[PDB]
Amino acid sequence: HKSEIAHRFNDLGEKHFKGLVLVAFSQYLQQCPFEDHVKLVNEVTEFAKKCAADESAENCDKSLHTLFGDKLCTVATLRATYGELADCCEKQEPERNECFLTHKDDHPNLPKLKPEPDAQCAAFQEDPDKFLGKYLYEVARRHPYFYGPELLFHAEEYKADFTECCPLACLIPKLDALKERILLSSAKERLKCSSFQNFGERAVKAWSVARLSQKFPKADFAEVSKIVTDLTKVHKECCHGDLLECADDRADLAKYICEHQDSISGKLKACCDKPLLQKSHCIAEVKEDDLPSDLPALAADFAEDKEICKHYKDAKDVFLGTFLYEYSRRHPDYSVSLLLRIAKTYEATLEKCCAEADPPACYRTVFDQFTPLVEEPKSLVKKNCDLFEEVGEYDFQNALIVRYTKKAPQVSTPTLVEIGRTLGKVGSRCCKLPESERLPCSENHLALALNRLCVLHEKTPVSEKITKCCTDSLAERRPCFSALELDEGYVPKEFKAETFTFHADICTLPEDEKQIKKQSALAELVKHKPKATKEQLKTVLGNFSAFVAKCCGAEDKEACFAEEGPKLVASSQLALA
Numbered sequence: 412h413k414s415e416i417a418h419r420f421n422d423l424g425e426k427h428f429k430g431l432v433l434v435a436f437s438q439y440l441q442q443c444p445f446e447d448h449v450k451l452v453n454e455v456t457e458f459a460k461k462c463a464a465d466e467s468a469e470n471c472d473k474s475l476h477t478l479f480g481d482k483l484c485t486v487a488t489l490r491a492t493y494g495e496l497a498d499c500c501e502k503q504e505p506e507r508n509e510c511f512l513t514h515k516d517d518h519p520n521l522p523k524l525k526p527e528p529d530a531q532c533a534a535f536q537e538d539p540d541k542f543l544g545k546y547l548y549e550v551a552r553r554h555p556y557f558y559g560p561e562l563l564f565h566a567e568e569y570k571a572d573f574t575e576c577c578p579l580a581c582l583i584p585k586l587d588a589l590k591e592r593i594l595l596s597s598a599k600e601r602l603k604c605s606s607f608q609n610f611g612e613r614a615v616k617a618w619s620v621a622r623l624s625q626k627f628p629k630a631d632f633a634e635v636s637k638i639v640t641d642l643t644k645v646h647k648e649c650c651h652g653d654l655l656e657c658a659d660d661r662a663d664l665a666k667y668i669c670e671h672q673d674s675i676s677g678k679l680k681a682c683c684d685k686p687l688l689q690k691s692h693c694i695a696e697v698k699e700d701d702l703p704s705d706l707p708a709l710a711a712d713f714a715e716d717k718e719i720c721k722h723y724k725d726a727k728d729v730f731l732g733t734f735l736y737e738y739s740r741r742h743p744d745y746s747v748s749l750l751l752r753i754a755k756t757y758e759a760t761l762e763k764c765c766a767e768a769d770p771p772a773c774y775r776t777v778f779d780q781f782t783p784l785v786e787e788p789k790s791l792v793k794k795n796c797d798l799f800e801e802v803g804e805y806d807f808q809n810a811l812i813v814r815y816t817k818k819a820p821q822v823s824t825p826t827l828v829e830i831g832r833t834l835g836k837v838g839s840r841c842c843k844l845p846e847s848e849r850l851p852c853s854e855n856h857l858a859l860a861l862n863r864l865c866v867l868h869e870k871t872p873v874s875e876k877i878t879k880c881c882t883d884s885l886a887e888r889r890p891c892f893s894a895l896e897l898d899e900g901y902v903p904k905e906f907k908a909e910t911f912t913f914h915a916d917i918c919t920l921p922e923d924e925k926q927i928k929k930q931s932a933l934a935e936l937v938k939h940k941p942k943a944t945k946e947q948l949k950t951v952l953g954n955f956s957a958f959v960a961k962c963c964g965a966e967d968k969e970a971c972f973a974e975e976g977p978k979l980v981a982s983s984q985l986a987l988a
């Protein structure tokens with residue numbers, strides 16, 4: 412390609428090209444106002460058009476990283492607003508880009524995007540482009556690793572919502588639903604980027620082999636391998652800020668899947684007769700195909716063949732990749748990480764056994780090594796769903812907050828509350844599902860919440876136990892966290908009465924925000940009395956809840972808090988001994 416920018420502009424079209432460039436700049440530079448970005452986008456886009464007209468024109472042959480980085484490095488008030496990035500701007504490519512990537516903020520702490528129906532409907536109708544641009548901008552800076560094409564898809568849902576409703580109780584629940592999809596989608600992609608960063612491309616491929624084999628059990632190993640190879644490149648590119656290349660390659664992949672859908676899956680038909688953005692999205696979210704009737708017996712190949720040790724030495728990556736493909740397509744009832752743990756156990760067995768005198772007798776029972784690995788997460792999910800269904804989301808979240816605060820009492824209270832609340836919503840999502848889909852739902856979603864915690868820990872490390880669980884092994888991460896008990900080396904956080912002291916401000920809050928305040932106090936209760944049982948803590952929190960409900964129902968709210976509060980604060984400590 413004579414001009415890469417021209418090529419991507421021609422492939423993607425202007426609207427998508429501008430959208431993706433806006434996303435990319437909003438993620439690299441998270442604090443800049445919407446005007447600093449829009450101007451940069453418009454200027455970049457004008458240059459692309461010029462280059463599309465004449466690819467020999469000066470600067471058109473430069474790399475995307477060079478052009479985009481140079482643009483970012485012109486931004487007004489760079490050192491004051493983006494101290495670390497200004498340092499990156501002294502470098503050449505690709506060092507500069509790598510510097511930009513190293514400095515993306517996963518916890519930027521900006522205001523919650525609260526919907527104002529009247530104000531936004533008014534801004535939408537006067538200038539939709541600006542309004543929809545703003546949505547891309549607001550979400551991108553909040554979620555710096557958000558999948559670029561996915562955000563454009565979600566912007567179009569945002570548009571349909573405002574197009575439908577504006578001509579305001581229509582609008583609020585539509586945006587609530589969309590926000591949950593943004594949260595989930597953001598968490599899924601961040602896991603992919605986190606996997607590249609912390610474990611590498613092999614780990615992302617193995618994860619993808621397992622997942623895609625589950626989704627497309629009809630497809631042969633060549634087809635799955637093909638799709639995994641291409642999908643891994645798409646994510647590598649999107650995770651490293653190469654959003655034009657990422658979008659273009661995602662579009663080509665969707666086309667290939669759809670051209671070969673009879674070979675791949677019967678569920679793709681609904682997806683494949685749609686527009687480019689919608690198509691790629693439906694495929695990424697597609698449900699698992701029905702099991703084929705001709706799935707092969709695996710014992711003969713992987714347990715009983717006499718030349719297995721030779722296979723493992725001569726064509727290791729293919730023998731193991733094939734096993735993972737075969738075992739995964741057969742087990743849609745397993746979580747992805749379980750499948751990965753199974754694959755690692757299979758590999759370790761063929762190392763151990765082949766170094767013995769008589770290997771066949773050794774590796775013959777290899778499938779029986781999987782049994783305890785399957786039973787552990789099955790029991791965990793049964794136990795957590797039993798609790799959820801008994802006590803409901805709020806108390807379930809509370810139990811998880813206690814559980815995780817005991818494991819990592821050095822973690823910040825907002826982080827512990829966030830993660831406990833997220834973990835508890837997994838119950839609501841997964842426990843009601845058909846019984847065979849609970850395990851994959853529960854563990855896969857758990858992987859997302861644990862990765863969020865790990866990502867926050869990269870920025871703000873407080874705990875060696877957390878470091879170990881986050882960095883030792885991607886497949887073993889959930890069981891590593893599950894095996895943590897009360898950190899015995901923790902010295903209890905000192906008592907501050909005011910931490911547990913409530914005031915009449917709580918009464919005006921929305922329900923979820925009242926809960927967060929009480930849940931924060933719950934975390935703090937555990938930090939000061941780490942040996943207190945979950946049953947002690949539930950009772951103490953019950954008493955706090957009753958006290959809040961009483962004084963919020965009072966004629967004089969603050970006199971109630973001022974009278975009743977200090978007694979409850981002192982007595983509650985005696986209950987936690």
Ligand SMILES: [Zn+2]
Binds near residue numbers: 412415418
């Ligand atoms: Zn090229």
Ligand SMILES: [Zn+2]
Binds near residue numbers: 423427658687688
């Ligand atoms: Zn597009």
Ligand SMILES: [Zn+2]
Binds near residue numbers: 486489
């Ligand atoms: Zn500026």
Ligand SMILES: [Zn+2]
Binds near residue numbers: 550553554593
């Ligand atoms: Zn968000």
Ligand SMILES: [Zn+2]
Binds near residue numbers: 592596
């Ligand atoms: Zn989505």
Ligand SMILES: [Zn+2]
Binds near residue numbers: 646
């Ligand atoms: Zn993807």
Ligand SMILES: [Zn+2]
Binds near residue numbers: 476508651652653
């Ligand atoms: Zn790149």
Ligand SMILES: [Zn+2]
Binds near residue numbers: 716717718719722
């Ligand atoms: Zn053989």
Ligand SMILES: [Zn+2]
Binds near residue numbers: 856
């Ligand atoms: Zn799910």
Ligand SMILES: [Zn+2]
Binds near residue numbers: 912913914916
């Ligand atoms: Zn207060």
Ligand SMILES: [Zn+2]
Binds near residue numbers: 922925
């Ligand atoms: Zn409440």
